[PDB]
Structures are given as C-alpha cells and as structure tokens.
Amino acid sequence: SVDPNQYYKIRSQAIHQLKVNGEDPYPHKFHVDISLTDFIQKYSHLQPGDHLTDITLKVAGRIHAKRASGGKLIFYDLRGEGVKLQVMANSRNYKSEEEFIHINNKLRRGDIIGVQGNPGKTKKGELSIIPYEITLLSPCLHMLPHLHFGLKDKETRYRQRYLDLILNDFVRQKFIIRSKIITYIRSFLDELGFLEIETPMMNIIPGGAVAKPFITYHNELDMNLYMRIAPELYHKMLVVGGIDRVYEIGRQFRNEGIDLTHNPEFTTCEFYMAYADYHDLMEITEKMVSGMVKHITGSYKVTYHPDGPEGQAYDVDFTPPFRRINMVEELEKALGMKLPETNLFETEETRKILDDICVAKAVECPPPRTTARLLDKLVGEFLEVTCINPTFICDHPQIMSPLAKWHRSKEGLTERFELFVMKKEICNAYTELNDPMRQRQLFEEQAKAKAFIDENFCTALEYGLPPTAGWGMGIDRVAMFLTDSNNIKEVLLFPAMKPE
Amino acid sequence: SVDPNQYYKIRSQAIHQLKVNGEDPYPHKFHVDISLTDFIQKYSHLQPGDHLTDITLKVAGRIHAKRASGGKLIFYDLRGEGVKLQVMANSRNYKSEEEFIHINNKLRRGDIIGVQGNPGKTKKGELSIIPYEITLLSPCLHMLPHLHFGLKDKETRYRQRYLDLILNDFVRQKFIIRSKIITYIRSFLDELGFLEIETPMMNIIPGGAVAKPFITYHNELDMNLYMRIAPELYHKMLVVGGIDRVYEIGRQFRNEGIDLTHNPEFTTCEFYMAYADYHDLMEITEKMVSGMVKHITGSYKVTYHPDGPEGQAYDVDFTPPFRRINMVEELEKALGMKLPETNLFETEETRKILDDICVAKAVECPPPRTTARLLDKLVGEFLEVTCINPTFICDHPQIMSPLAKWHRSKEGLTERFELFVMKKEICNAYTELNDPMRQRQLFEEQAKAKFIDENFCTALEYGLPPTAGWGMGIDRVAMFLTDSNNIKEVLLFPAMKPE
Numbered sequence A: 001s002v003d004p005n006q007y008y009k010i011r012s013q014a015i016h017q018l019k020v021n022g023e024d025p026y027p028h029k030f031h032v033d034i035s036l037t038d039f040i041q042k043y044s045h046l047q048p049g050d051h052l053t054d055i056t057l058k059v060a061g062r063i064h065a066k067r068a069s070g071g072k073l074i075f076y077d078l079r080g081e082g083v084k085l086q087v088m089a090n091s092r093n094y095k096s097e098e099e100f101i102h103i104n105n106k107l108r109r110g111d112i113i114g115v116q117g118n119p120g121k122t123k124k125g126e127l128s129i130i131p132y133e134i135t136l137l138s139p140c141l142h143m144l145p146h147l148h149f150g151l152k153d154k155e156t157r158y159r160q161r162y163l164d165l166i167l168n169d170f171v172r173q174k175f176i177i178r179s180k181i182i183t184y185i186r187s188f189l190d191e192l193g194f195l196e197i198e199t200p201m202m203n204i205i206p207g208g209a210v211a212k213p214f215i216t217y218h219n220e221l222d223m224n225l226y227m228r229i230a231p232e233l234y235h236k237m238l239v240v241g242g243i244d245r246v247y248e249i250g251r252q253f254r255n256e257g258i259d260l261t262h263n264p265e266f267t268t269c270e271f272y273m274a275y276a277d278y279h280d281l282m283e284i285t286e287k288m289v290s291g292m293v294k295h296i297t298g299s300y301k302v303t304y305h306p307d308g309p310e311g312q313a314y315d316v317d318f319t320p321p322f323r324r325i326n327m328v329e330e331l332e333k334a335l336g337m338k339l340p341e342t343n344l345f346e347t348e349e350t351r352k353i354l355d356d357i358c359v360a361k362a363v364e365c366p367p368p369r370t371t372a373r374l375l376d377k378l379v380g381e382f383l384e385v386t387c388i389n390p391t392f393i394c395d396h397p398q399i400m401s402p403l404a405k406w407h408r409s410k411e412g413l414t415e416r417f418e419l420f421v422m423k424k425e426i427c428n429a430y431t432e433l434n435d436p437m438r439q440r441q442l443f444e445e446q447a448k449a450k451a452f453i454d455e456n457f458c459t460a461l462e463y464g465l466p467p468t469a470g471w472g473m474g475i476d477r478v479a480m481f482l483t484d485s486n487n488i489k490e491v492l493l494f495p496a497m498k499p500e
Numbered sequence B: 001s002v003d004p005n006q007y008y009k010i011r012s013q014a015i016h017q018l019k020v021n022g023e024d025p026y027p028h029k030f031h032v033d034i035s036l037t038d039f040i041q042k043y044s045h046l047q048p049g050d051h052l053t054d055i056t057l058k059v060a061g062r063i064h065a066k067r068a069s070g071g072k073l074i075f076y077d078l079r080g081e082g083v084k085l086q087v088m089a090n091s092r093n094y095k096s097e098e099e100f101i102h103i104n105n106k107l108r109r110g111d112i113i114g115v116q117g118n119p120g121k122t123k124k125g126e127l128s129i130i131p132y133e134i135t136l137l138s139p140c141l142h143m144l145p146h147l148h149f150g151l152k153d154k155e156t157r158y159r160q161r162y163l164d165l166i167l168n169d170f171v172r173q174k175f176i177i178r179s180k181i182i183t184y185i186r187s188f189l190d191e192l193g194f195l196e197i198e199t200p201m202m203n204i205i206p207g208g209a210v211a212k213p214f215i216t217y218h219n220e221l222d223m224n225l226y227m228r229i230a231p232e233l234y235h236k237m238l239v240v241g242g243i244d245r246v247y248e249i250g251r252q253f254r255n256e257g258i259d260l261t262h263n264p265e266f267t268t269c270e271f272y273m274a275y276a277d278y279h280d281l282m283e284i285t286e287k288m289v290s291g292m293v294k295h296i297t298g299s300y301k302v303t304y305h306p307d308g309p310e311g312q313a314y315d316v317d318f319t320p321p322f323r324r325i326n327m328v329e330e331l332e333k334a335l336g337m338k339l340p341e342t343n344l345f346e347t348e349e350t351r352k353i354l355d356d357i358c359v360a361k362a363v364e365c366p367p368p369r370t371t372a373r374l375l376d377k378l379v380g381e382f383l384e385v386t387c388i389n390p391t392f393i394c395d396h397p398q399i400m401s402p403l404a405k406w407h408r409s410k411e412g413l414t415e416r417f418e419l420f421v422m423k424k425e426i427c428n429a430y431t432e433l434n435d436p437m438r439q440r441q442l443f444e445e446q447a448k449a450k451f452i453d454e455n456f457c458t459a460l461e462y463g464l465p466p467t468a469g470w471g472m473g474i475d476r477v478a479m480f481l482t483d484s485n486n487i488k489e490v491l492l493f494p495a496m497k498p499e
Helices: A004-020 A036-043 A097-106 A154-159 A161-167 A169-191 A232-240 A278-297 A327-335 A348-360 A371-384 A436-450 A455-464 A475-482 B004-020 B036-043 B097-106 B154-159 B161-167 B169-191 B232-240 B278-297 B327-335 B348-360 B371-384 B436-448 B454-462 B474-481
Strands: A057-068 A073-080 A083-090 A112-121 A127-138 A215-218 A223-227 A245-253 A265-274 A301-304 A314-317 A323-326 A391-394 A416-421 A424-431 A468-474 B057-068 B073-080 B083-090 B112-121 B127-138 B215-218 B223-227 B245-253 B265-274 B301-304 B314-317 B323-326 B391-394 B416-421 B424-431 B467-473
Touching: A036 A057, A036 A083, A036 A112, A036 A127, A057 A083, A057 A127, A073 A112, A083 A112, A097 A127, A154 A161, A161 A169, A161 B232, A161 B454, A169 A245, A169 A265, A169 A278, A169 A475, A169 B169, A232 A245, A232 A265, A232 A455, A232 A468, A232 B161, A245 B245, A265 A278, A265 A475, A278 A391, A278 A416, A278 A424, A278 A468, A278 A475, A301 A475, A323 A327, A327 A371, A348 A371, A371 A391, A424 A475, A436 A455, A455 B161, A468 A475, B036 B057, B036 B073, B036 B083, B036 B112, B036 B127, B057 B083, B057 B127, B073 B112, B083 B112, B097 B127, B154 B161, B161 B169, B169 B245, B169 B265, B169 B278, B169 B474, B232 B245, B232 B265, B232 B454, B232 B467, B265 B474, B278 B391, B278 B416, B278 B424, B278 B467, B278 B474, B301 B474, B323 B327, B327 B371, B348 B371, B371 B391, B424 B474, B436 B454, B467 B474
Parallel strands: A083 A127, A323 A391, B083 B127, B323 B391
Antiparallel strands: A057 A073, A057 A112, A073 A083, A112 A127, A215 A223, A215 B215, A245 A265, A265 A468, A301 A314, A391 A416, A416 A424, A424 A468, B057 B073, B057 B112, B073 B083, B112 B127, B215 B223, B245 B265, B265 B467, B301 B314, B391 B416, B416 B424, B424 B467
C-alpha cells in the first residue's frame, strides 16, 4: 500500500502539474449561492426520482467519500457546516463528457470543491445535487484516515485541531457550546447593567497570590512585567471610580505544569457588584447557571461522564433551586459528630481535634496539617464528593477565607459560597474587603510567605470602596461539564502540548 | 490651609477613632432600595415643596459637596451612576437631634454614605431625599481637588483612573462607548453566523511579523514562549477544519516604545470568512461601521477633535455608501499625472520616476527609497489626508501587499482594501492566500528579513478554501468615537512610564 509520505509526494506533484498545465487548483474565488444547510432544508421535501432541471445552484464543501458506480456515474459525499449532501455526478448531465472525465480523474478524498448543478433526489431517496460543473478549489495533499475509522488518538487530535474538526463533528458541537456559554454570560450580565471591561494582562508587580508567574522583559522600559492571574484589583478600582457593576471574561496565565487538567493560559469570568453581598450573588448565580444550561441544552437535566463515554454516567439536575448547605453544619451532620464552636477554630486544641478526626476517618491530609487544610480535606471527602447536582457550599470559616468579609450573625464564619457541580467547584463568590488597613495587612502577610504590595490599590481603597461582592467562574471547567468532556484539552481549540 | 498629607493623617486618625469607638465606618453592607437614576425618574414629577412622609427609601452614593445652611440643615450633593441627587438633611426630620449632629460632624467630601429617607422637592425645585438615617459606608481619607476645579492633569488621570472617574463624568461616557463598540461588533458578526473563538496568546515561535515580541520562559517546559501579535494563523486553521466563519476580539502584545499612541497591549478584532472575497467584506464593513455609529451615537454624523477640544473640529459623515477609491487611479488623478503601467512597478525605471515625483512634490520619503515606500508616502500625502469621512482605499499594488491574493483583472494589483477615517486606517481586509507552497515562500521571505510555522503550512496542505480576512483596531475606533486624540483616553489602565 501507499504510505502517507508517498501519497503526499505523489499528490503534490499532481497539483504542481495542474499549475504548469494552466489549471491552477487554487482559483481566486467561488461564490456560493446557498449553504448546504439551507439546501437541505429547502429541498428535503423532494420525492425519490425528482430532478429540477430548472434550478441551478452553486454549493461547496469537502469531499469525504468518492464512490464510482459504472464509469459515467460517480457519487461524492460532500460535507460542510456539520452536514452532508450527495453529489450525483452523472456524465450525461455534466457540461461535457470529456470534461466530466477530466474533473473526476483529479479529485481525491479530502478535496474542497465547488459544485454548480441542479437539486434532485435519487431513486433510493437521497437528496443530491446533479452537477453541471465541478471545480477543484483546494486539494487535500495528505492521506486522510480510512473512512469509518476516523481520528481517535487524542494526542493527534489536540496537535492537529483542523484534522480533528474535519473528521469529528462532535468536536465542532463542543466548541459551539463553549461559545454559547460565553455569549450567554455576557447577555445575562449586560442585562443587569454590568459594564464589560478590559484591564491589563501585564503588570509591573506580581502580587500576593502563591501562583508562579510568567515574566517578560520590556526593552523600552528596562523592566520586567508579570502576566496577570486575575483582574480583581483593577475591577475594584473601577468600583471605587463609581462604575458599580463590572465584569471581564478574559485570559489568565499560570506558569506551572501542563497536563490534561492544566493549561498555561485559561479563561475566567470575574464580576464585582457594588452594594451586593453573597446572598445577592447566590440568587444571581442560580438564575444564570440554571438558565444557561436550559437555554443551551434544552433541559435542566444534563448527563456527564467523568471517566469517559464507556464509564459511569451521572445525571446532573440544574432545576432551581440549587441545594444549599452550610459547610460546618453539614460537615458535622456528615461526620455524625459535633465540631467545636466556630470561634474556636484558631486554637491548637481544635486543630488536633480535627487532626484526629482525619486519622479516625482515614482522610488523607499532607503537611502542613493546619486547621484550614484539615477542614478543607474533610469537606472535600464528606461534602464535595456529594455535590453532583449544583450545590452551594456556604459560610466557610474565616481561617479558610482570608479575602472574604466576616459573617454578621455567626462568629468565625465569612460571607462566602462556592458553587459545586459534579464534585468540582465552578464559581467562587464573597463579600469583598474594603477597609484599606485590612487590605494592607493581607498584602503584607501574603508578602511574608512569598519571601509584593500593590500600593496603588491600597491608595485607591483610601479614596473609598463601597461595600462590594465579587464573583469568579472558570469558563473552561464549565465548558467541560456542558460538552461532556473529562479533559480540558477537549474544550481548548489549541491546547498547549508537551512538545514531541 | 492643610496640605494633602496632613489631611490624610488627620482623617485616618479620625476613622481609627471611629473604629475603637464601636462605630466602624466599614460596615458589612448597605442594601439599596432603588438606584439614583431610578429615583430621579420616579420622583422628578413631584412639586416644589413636596415631602412624601409615606415613602422611606434607601439610596447610596458619594458626597461631592457638603453645604451647611444654619446648623440644623445641611445639603449633600450625592453622586453615582453618572447622576446626582441632593440630600436635604434637616435636623427636625432626622432620627434624633444628637444623632443628626453626630453623623454630620464625621462626614467629609468624598465619603460614600447610605441614605434612608423620604423623597421630596425643596422650594427651589430641587429633587431631594429627606434622610431619617445616614450611614458612613466608606470614608475618603484623601483630600480631593477643590470642587469646580476637578482633575485636569492627564498624567494624574491616567495613573489614578478611579480618581479620574470620580471627578470626570465624560470619562465614564467614553468607556461606555468603548464597551458598546465591542458589544456591537459581536452582535453584528454573531448574526452573520460567525463563531466567536479563543486562540492562544502564547506560542512556541514568534512568527514572521516584524513586530518586536514579548518573550517569557516556561519553567516546566524549559522553553521560551512568545506573546501573540495576531490570531491569524489559528483562525485559518479553523477554517481548514470546516468552521467557515470565525472572529476573535482579543488582546495583542507589542514590545516597543510606550507613548501617547502606543501601549504594550491593545485590542483587535479579526474575522475570516470562507468563500468570501474583499467585495463581500467591503459591504460587510460598510454596514457594520455605519450601523455601529448610528446605533451608539444616534446619527451618522460625528464630530472629532484631532488636536484637542480647543483645536479644529472635523465633521465625519458615516452615511452609506462610503466613498470608494482605487489607490493607483486616484493617486494618478490627485497627482494630475499618469503613472507607469501597474505590471512595471518592479522595474528600477519606475522606481526613479516615483522618486522624481516625490522630489517634485516635496513628499518626504526616508531611505530606503523603494517603489513600495515611495508609493506609500505619495498615497498618504495625496489620498489618505483627504479621507475624513470613511473611505475605502482599494486594489493596492502587489508590491505593497504581500499577504493578499492577486487581482484577476488588473495585473500587479491585489484583492485588498483599507478603511480610512479621519486620515487614519481603522480596518484592513483582503482575500487570503491558500496555496501552501506560496505561504511557505512568504514565511521564508519573512524569516530571511530577520520564522516558519510548519504546523500552519501542514494545515494548508490539507486544504484551505478560498477565504477573506478582516482586521480592526478597536482602540483607534474607540478614540474616534469618544472624541479622543490619545490612546490612553480609551484604555482604562494605560501603561505608564515609571515615575
């Protein structure tokens, strides 16, 4: 058999031969009279045997199958826009029989062609176009996988997305879903009077987050810049400036390991809303997420395959209202035991109480075994695994929530929630800090662990930030869950890949 | 008078004392019953003298002016959402007289306060809220500029945008316009069946563009990455994959000088459309841009100040159809002269004809004086300066358009256009190249003048349909539609040379 390299060499020669022969297989243009989708909807009503010799139309697409029948009849499987239309190339209906031979002899599977012909339906009842003229618009120089075998190797799909999209329609449907999600988010927030904003992705200071950053050098400034991890601080500065409702769906950057659940660049949505608290955002999140799912999917009911198409299937019910649980209470109810008072979560006596609880319940916790990390491990093992449907986990302790405002009624807790779906977090929200002295404390304590402080942002707080609530969502993970992908590369058009 | 640092120290102490005194001026929250804008529309019908003791409402905002009248009556100018509402704090109407004294003594200009009170209108006819209780929500610890004097120093405005927004409402309107522009573009393209996509901003190779790049090191990969200059190559790979219409409104990065018209990161919109040429995109561009202007501004007519509010004012008429000019033809018509044949633009004698023409018409052109650069200077001096209204400049010569497909009818020209507004280009479009050998040639020529995207060459070897591309600088469009002669005016947080 021919191998891929020999096929590519032979076909490049043929196309080169077409050029020198005055038949350049890359012509200036091909105006399409109608899309394949319109053609199918406009002419699906025809009866087996029909042929409209009175209507000539120009369509185009890519050849996926070429089946010769008798030598004066050829069938082409023409694909585009996720649909398919048969080209019944019948010599007697072509411009001329000599040209009919000439065009069929040059066309191969994968070629992009333009078809000018008549609508019709075969005797078997297959909607077809009877071509008067076929034009090779762009040839496929490479050998495509066997028809019906397709492209299944994930590494190849992710490194050649164009090939994945040529062969796999479900991949096209995935990225349509992803775009619909972002579009839906903008519609929802725009209708609530939020201003969609653009803030810097390059900053002079890295800031207090533990995340390892991308560093780049600015030659004109003789200075280093750091790629952003979140737009948070710029958004609140705009809230200080009087823009009460702001959101940004943008790229963030993390300089860490690349694998199936980690990409160096990713997409988040953050919004900040003056004079709201986390209960306001909870109601906002419920309506947005439930409405998104029903609008894009058709139902509140969604099935998801955490381990792959052949693995277990989980039914995820987005029917509002979402289940609401308070972290400490449900953790007590799930353990079947009373935990210490919430204002005692900083004493060492409660730390070992929790340490013992992890020992007794075989809950893994690597060092440091702090109260915060032990609680976090216990919650993930007793409360997050339970959250298959969308579930708000609420009122986290302060010792686990440094950035959030304190709870008004309950000592030691904060005004915070996390929305969990399929055991994973999909958005974070809490009432923000607006005391400039408290913000300076947090920046210094973050800096102490690093070894910077955003003095500009501290100054902005000194001018006055109103009470504000913040919200953040990972778009990629939402896209995974709504495209039934157990992998982040499935929802990234061009995922970062560890080089060959 | 007190200087700003002494004011900040005195007010910080006072707020600290409020804390230790159990009246923390940062309370958890303040629920607003109604926005200032809704309040104004709902209660502007009231009569001078009215006071609705039958309605209690909670509003909030920032104090911009505090004028005491007699000691039991104080007026506060409360601002928010770009609007303004007066608080007529009347002691007889407050919760209690001691609390009324206590709250007014702590409030200063700039403080964010919550007001619970009754709608009403004073005898002068000013819509007001009669407070039953005022709450300090966040104090302004810094001295603000004198009322009526505001913030005018551009450098200060750009380094403290929050302060610029506090003091200058026109700045708020500008960035509302900017968001409307991006939103309008998405609306237009989505309705034409375009898929809004996200393509990588980090790549392993810089690519052939002359642009100076940002380089960053990936530790886990032990490799350098380059910040993108355009998403072009990823979009066409998606068109190869069968997604015929794609667009991306995203950030690009250039590592060059920072000044009033240059920022290291900026926003463009690119889209690619299978089976279209530049005439298709010309009609698309006309409808999008004209419709955008009328939708956001209310008219096709826009006024613009290239040199500032006190300088010359230009009327820019976006009424379709836009004027269309063919570069070589109008350059001949404008020069009053016949140029050489369009297929002779590579001979040295045609280069010297043009060199002489620039000498005779005093058109500055620095070396190298190639045919391409001499034409470009002549076009900018004779054809682009005239383009005040939106004007399509079309059919550029091949010698000036390496990325564009060749024109079938006119030898030496390409299938290309540029949309010019106020003498500046705002979008470029042409019929793309899809011959994989030709793209490889272009990549090789780009590489010698310094790389080759082998992956993108392979994708073309699988087959790219005839496709047309389109690109627009959002920032420059935002400038022209917010009457800004400066890029920092349309960037929320512009890059700034270190103090």
